[PDB]
Design a protein around this ligand. Structure first.
Ligand SMILES: C[C@H](CCCC(C)(C)C)[C@H]1CC[C@@H]2[C@@H]3C[C@H](OS(=O)(=O)O)[C@H]4C[C@H](OS(=O)(=O)O)[C@@H](OS(=O)(=O)O)C[C@]4(C)[C@H]3CC[C@@]21C
Ligand SMILES: [Zn+2]
Lengths: 257, 6
């Protein structure tokens, strides 16, 4: 099986319920990393480091707020998948909110590693709207709790922390998928990475990623297809094989201003 | 819990 066969499936509308898994690869072409004081990169989402020095995380918060970055071809492709009534759900590891901006509604999304839309005082555990700390974060200040002075951390999943309970939508989405799209992740983080195994054995799995990662490398199924290389390139080659290149380009420079 | 493989 090949990338052409997968494109033929979508075009025929044989794949009615597409489930997508995305990671950091799809947001790099918009200029998002993954000027800081980080001992190693992962420490930005680690609690022992965060409590020692919250500033590098809050630098990224200030960066990741709406406006600064734009969705790229990858996002807009997934927006076409929804527009044509083909997206069952999008599962994302990203915390940059670009899926929402591209036009994917909240109901078609699982922000599996959390969100800046709300926050919690790390000490007393009072909940905050994510706008209630905006001024502070923008003014290079560490947000503090009105009631106890503890650092107010955004609801981003740090290492060791449980994922939001919305993640449980995977129990009903994955068994129901007729096609799985893995785009721009090296499937390193658990339990997200494990979802690739949750689709039925007869289900096509399409990896559009830099390298052969996860279960596609270790225990490949017959209907798995890898389009290795740059993610943007890989997406465009599927878009072309679908006949959506014109519709895409119309969508992309429509969505700028 | 959110963990790396390695
Ligand atoms: C049990 C069934 C699975 C059913 C599948 C079957 C049919 C296979 C059994 C779950 C599927 C998802 C669903 C939701 C998804 C909701 O997220 S939302 O979409 O962003 O609001 C959840 C919101 C809250 O989670 S939290 O992590 O962010 O604090 C928390 O509520 S709170 O305690 O009052 O704050 C729990 C939620 C309401 C869960 C509860 C489990 C579910 C009913
Ligand atoms: Zn507090």
């Amino acid at each position: 099986l090949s990338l052409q066969d997968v494109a033929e499936l979508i075009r025929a509308r044989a794949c009615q319920r597409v489930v997508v898994m995305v990671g950091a690869g799809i947001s790099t072409p918009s200029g998002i990393p993954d000027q800081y004081d980080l001992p190693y990169p992962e420490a930005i989402f680690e609690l022992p480091f965060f409590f020692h020095n919250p500033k590098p995380f809050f630098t990224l918060a200030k960066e990741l707020y709406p406006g600064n970055y734009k969705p790229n071809v990858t996002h807009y492709f997934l927006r076409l998948l929804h527009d044509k009534g083909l997206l069952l759900r999008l599962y994302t590891q990203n915390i940059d909110g670009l899926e929402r901006v591209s036009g994917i509604p909240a109901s078609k999304l699982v922000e599996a590693h959390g969100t800046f839309a709300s926050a919690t005082c790390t000490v007393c555990q009072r909940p905050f709207p994510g706008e209630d700390i905006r001024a502070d974060v923008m003014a290079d200040r560490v947000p503090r709790c009105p009631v106890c002075t503890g650092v107010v951390k955004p609801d981003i999943v740090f290492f060791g922390e449980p994922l939001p309970q919305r993640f449980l939508l995977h129990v009903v989405d994955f068994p129901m998928a007729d096609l799985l799209l893995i785009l721009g992740t090296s499937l390193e983080v658990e339990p997200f990475a494990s979802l690739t195994e949750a689709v039925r054995s007869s289900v096509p799995r399409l990896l559009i990623n830099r390298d052969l990662v996860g279960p596609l490398a270790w225990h490949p199924r017959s209907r798995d297809v890898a389009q290795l290389g740059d993610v943007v390139h890989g997406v465009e080659s599927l878009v072309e094989l679908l006949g959506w290149t014109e519709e895409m380009r119309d969508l992309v420079q429509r969505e700028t201003g | 819990g959110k963990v790396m493989r390695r």
